[PDB]
Every structure is written in structure tokens, then in C-alpha cells.
């Protein structure tokens, strides 16, 4: 089990308010401790020195108003650090700039809002932290711009593309984390990893609009399908762990190559379980076994 | 061997400070320390058994070694030794020296 | 009540204070000699 982002209203409380005994806030906890009612040891208040004994009585029986503002205003500014509304080095300015703002306006209806906004801003950290795990929000809106600009449902050659419409939508829903459909240049493009080692254009996909339905030769790479760019080829291998059945595997490469993209993944996860064993058995071989990779090469070439 | 014979009364057979003390005096030696600085008053017995150390055998401690050949050139004195440690000769290096 | 707010009728250094730099006081001693940077109280028994 794991925690959510360390509670932003509590992190700032951790650094300000008393830890052990706040005699006013934890009143019936000190009162329980002084009445010899605590289950740990009853006479923990009796065996204590007489002077600090009296300090517990004066503070608990007469509750003293402790300063609450600096654990409320800091609760906003540290949430401003976790929601990233300010930079971490900005904690010197905004903490006091708003304290100087409430120095001028201590006593309007604004601070009655402020503590209600404290509960709102602390929840906004918890809302966004669960929302950044699903980076769908900066992805689906971007795909809405892709679906509108690109002409949808126009394969007047042959139609297998209706299945492909949902295939791109499945990539948004299944993996959301680093999967951002960034619109930097006017061509749309999707990143798969946190460092973006396969971020091809979804407008390199515009090469497929004339190749949505053509004739198939035989079983070896086609006499025509050499036109398919390694840019668009990178996309079609990336949608392959998402959609398989739907596109016709016998009419054009939209389906025949998509089934063949599963052959690339099908070998990969087998060889993953192959490599994790031969590398693990290095005590009995005592060599840099590149034959683990050479057999992997042999299991792809000699078929 | 049985380690509870005649030193039991004298409390010498004992294993710690609070062993053969009355268990109500531990919180006066420790807590009110500089006031009642008393823990050697009841002299706690040592913890030096027979377990791994005892070598009732002709075990070598100090051995000599004197070189094979001699070279008496003016600038660099050379001495060749072919040292051999058999078994259980467990020296720590700072012990070894060269008697000039 | 204000008597023991001056850290006069306190028990100990790292404990009586807010836990924000209690974590940091135990980790930092050579960077800053923090034990002499704050009052440590000691009180009369019964």
C-alpha cells in the first residue's frame, strides 16, 4: 500500500504547529493524560517534576488561544508548491506577500472564504494528482482536434478504417500516463514513453488514405506496399498492442501487416522470458553470452 | 561445563549488573546517575568463557626468517625470502618487521 | 497561559518543538551546531 501526494495542508501544518502536546487543541488528550486516565501508565503525571506538572494544568484547564493563521496561509502556499502554482524557490515571497495582503485586510469577509478555499485548494492537489496519472485530459481534447481536422469515414477505395477510428481512441483510454497527443507543429503526433523514443506523426498516417484497400499478392512483403513510410510503420506497430481483430487480414496490409505486427510482439515477450534466464545463469556459463541475442536473431531470420 | 558451583553466593558466577541485585534498584543507578553514581559497588562478573580461544597445543607465536642469497652492492641492498605459512598462522600485518 | 511558552518548563530539545525541523535537527549537526542554537530546559523534581 502507498500514499497520495503528502497532504499539502498537512505538510505546512507539520512544519508550523506543535508536535507533542498542544494543550488547547488536544485539550481532552492532555486532560486525559493529567487526570491519570491514560492506559499506558496512569501516574505519568505524578512522577513528573512539580513545575512542568503545573505548566500542564494552567494550559489545559484554562485553554490558551494559539496562533492558527500561519498554518492556514502556509497551507495554501505549500499546496501552491504541490499543485505547482509557484516554484519551490518562490516560498519566501508568496508566503509573506499574501500575509502582507491579509495584514491590510485581516478583517473582511475574505479570510472566512480563505479557510473554505484552504479545503478547496488542498482538494485541488488531490484531484489533479489522480488526474495527472490519467493524462487523458491533455490527450482526448487533442484527439478531438485530430478527428475534426482529418476527414473521417472517407475510404471510397475499400473500407477497413471504421475499425481504426476506435483503435486510436483505445490508445487514449488504455495507457494514459505519458501518452500525450502533442500539437506542437500542425501535424499531430503521439508520444508513448516518458523519454519519447517512438513519437511519429499521425499526419504521416495521411499516406494510408490511398492504401485503405488494395490487392494482396502473396505472403511475402508486397510488390506495392513498399511505399509505407517507417514513420507510418512506427504508428502501426504502436497501435498493435491495442487492436488486432477487425481490419481484414487478407485484403490489404491494414490487417495482414497488423497481424504481422503481433508476430513482432509475439517473438519479443517470448525472447524476454528467454533472455531473463540465460543472463541469470551466468555462474555456470562464465562468459559474455551474446548467443542469447544471436539465438534471438536466429529465431527471427531462419523461419 | 557447569558454571554454577561455589561463587553463587559471592555472586561471581553472575552475567550482568542487574543479575544478582534486587530488581528494584536498576532505576536509581541509571536514572538518578550523577547523584547515586553506583554500579561498580555491586561488582558485575566478567564474560570471558572457554568457547573459541583455548589452544592447549604447541602453537607457534614468534618465528624467524633469514634470506636465501646475499648481494653487497653500494647503492641497493637486496634480500630474497621465500616465506611459508602452513596452517592457522593468523598474523595481522603490523606485527611483521625487518631486523636490520 | 504564557509561562512555559518561553521554553522554561520544557523537557527536551528536539521534542517540545514543531516536527518541521525536528527531522532536520537530528540529521544536521556538523553543518550547523544546532543543539547550542536553542534553549534546552531542565526542571526541579518533587
Amino acid at each position: 500500500m502507498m500514499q497520495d501526494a503528502t497532504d499539502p495542508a498537512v505538510r505546512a501544518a507539520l512544519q508550523s504547529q506543535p508536535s507533542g502536546l498542544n494543550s488547547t487543541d488536544d485539550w481532552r488528550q492532555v486532560m486525559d493524560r493529567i487526570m491519570s486516565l491514560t492506559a499506558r501508565n496512569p501516574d505519568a503525571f505524578r512522577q513528573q517534576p512539580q513545575a512542568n506538572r503545573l505548566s500542564a494544568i494552567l494550559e489545559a484547564v484554562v485553554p490558551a488561544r494559539a496562533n492558527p493563521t500561519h498554518e492556514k496561509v502556509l497551507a495554501i502556499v505549500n499546496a501552491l508548491a504541490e499543485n505547482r502554482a509557484i516554484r519551490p524557490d518562490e516560498a519566501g515571497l508568496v508566503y509573506d506577500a499574501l500575509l502582507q495582503r491579509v495584514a491590510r485586510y485581516n478583517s473582511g469577509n475574505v479570510q472566512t472564504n480563505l479557510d473554505r478555499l484552504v479545503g478547496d485548494v488542498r482538494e485541488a492537489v488531490a484531484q489533479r494528482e489522480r488526474a495527472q496519472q490519467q493524462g487523458n485530459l491533455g490527450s482526448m481534447v487533442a484527439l478531438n482536434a485530430f478527428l475534426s481536422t482529418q476527414p473521417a469515414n472517407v475510404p471510397r477505395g475499400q473500407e477497413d478504417y471504421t475499425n481504426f477510428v476506435s483503435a486510436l481512441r483505445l490508445m487514449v483510454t488504455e495507457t494514459p500516463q505519458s501518452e500525450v497527443y502533442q500539437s506542437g507543429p500542425d501535424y499531430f503526433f503521439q508520444t508513448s514513453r516518458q523519454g519519447l523514443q517512438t513519437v511519429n506523426l499521425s499526419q504521416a498516417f495521411k499516406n494510408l488514405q490511398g492504401l485503405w484497400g488494395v490487392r494482396a499478392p502473396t505472403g511475402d512483403r508486397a510488390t506495392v506496399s513498399s511505399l509505407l513510410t517507417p514513420n507510418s510503420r512506427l504508428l502501426l506497430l504502436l497501435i498493435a498492442p491495442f487492436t488486432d481483430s477487425g481490419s481484414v487480414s487478407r485484403d490489404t496490409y491494414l490487417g495482414h501487416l497488423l497481424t504481422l505486427y503481433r508476430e513482432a510482439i509475439g517473438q519479443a515477450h517470448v525472447d524476454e522470458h528467454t533472455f531473463q534466464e540465460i543472463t541469470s545463469v551466468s555462474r555456470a556459463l562464465g562468459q559474455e553470452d551474446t548467443g542469447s541475442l544471436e539465438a534471438t536473431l536466429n529465431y527471427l531470420l531462419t523461419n | 561445563p557447569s558454571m554454577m558451583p561455589q561463587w553463587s553466593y559471592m555472586h561471581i558466577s553472575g552475567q550482568d549488573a542487574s543479575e544478582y541485585l534486587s530488581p528494584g534498584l536498576v532505576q536509581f543507578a541509571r536514572a538518578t546517575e550523577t547523584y547515586f553514581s553506583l554500579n561498580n559497588k555491586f561488582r558485575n562478573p566478567t564474560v570471558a568463557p572457554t568457547h573459541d580461544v583455548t589452544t592447549d597445543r604447541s602453537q607457534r607465536l614468534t618465528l624467524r626468517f633469514i634470506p636465501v642469497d646475499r648481494e653487497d652492492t653500494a647503492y641497493s641492498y637486496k634480500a630474497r625470502f621465500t616465506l611459508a605459512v602452513g596452517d592457522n598462522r593468523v598474523l595481522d600485518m603490523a606485527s611483521t618487521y625487518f631486523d636490520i | 497561559p504564557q509561562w512555559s511558552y518561553m521554553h522554561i518548563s520544557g523537557q527536551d530539545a528536539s521534542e517540545y518543538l514543531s516536527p518541521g525541523l525536528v527531522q532536520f535537527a537530528r540529521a544536521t549537526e556538523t553543518y550547523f551546531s544546532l543543539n547550542n542554537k536553542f534553549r534546552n530546559p531542565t526542571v526541579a523534581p518533587t
Binding site: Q48, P49 | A29, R30, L38, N39 | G10, Q11, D12
Partner: peptide, 24 residues
């Protein structure tokens, strides 16, 4: 007894003790 000594920081007595024997 926990009451018997004056202790630092609101704690009666704190760190326990040990005194060495003569021979060695």
C-alpha cells in the same frame, strides 16, 4: 523510581548507566 531524579525536557530521568570492573 521514575520520580526520584530531576530530568531535562519534562522527562524525570533519562539515560541508564554502567561502571567497569577493576581488573584488566
Amino acid at each position: 523510581f521514575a520520580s526520584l531524579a530531576p530530568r531535562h525536557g519534562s522527562r524525570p530521568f533519562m539515560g541508564n548507566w554502567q561502571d567497569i570492573g577493576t581488573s584488566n
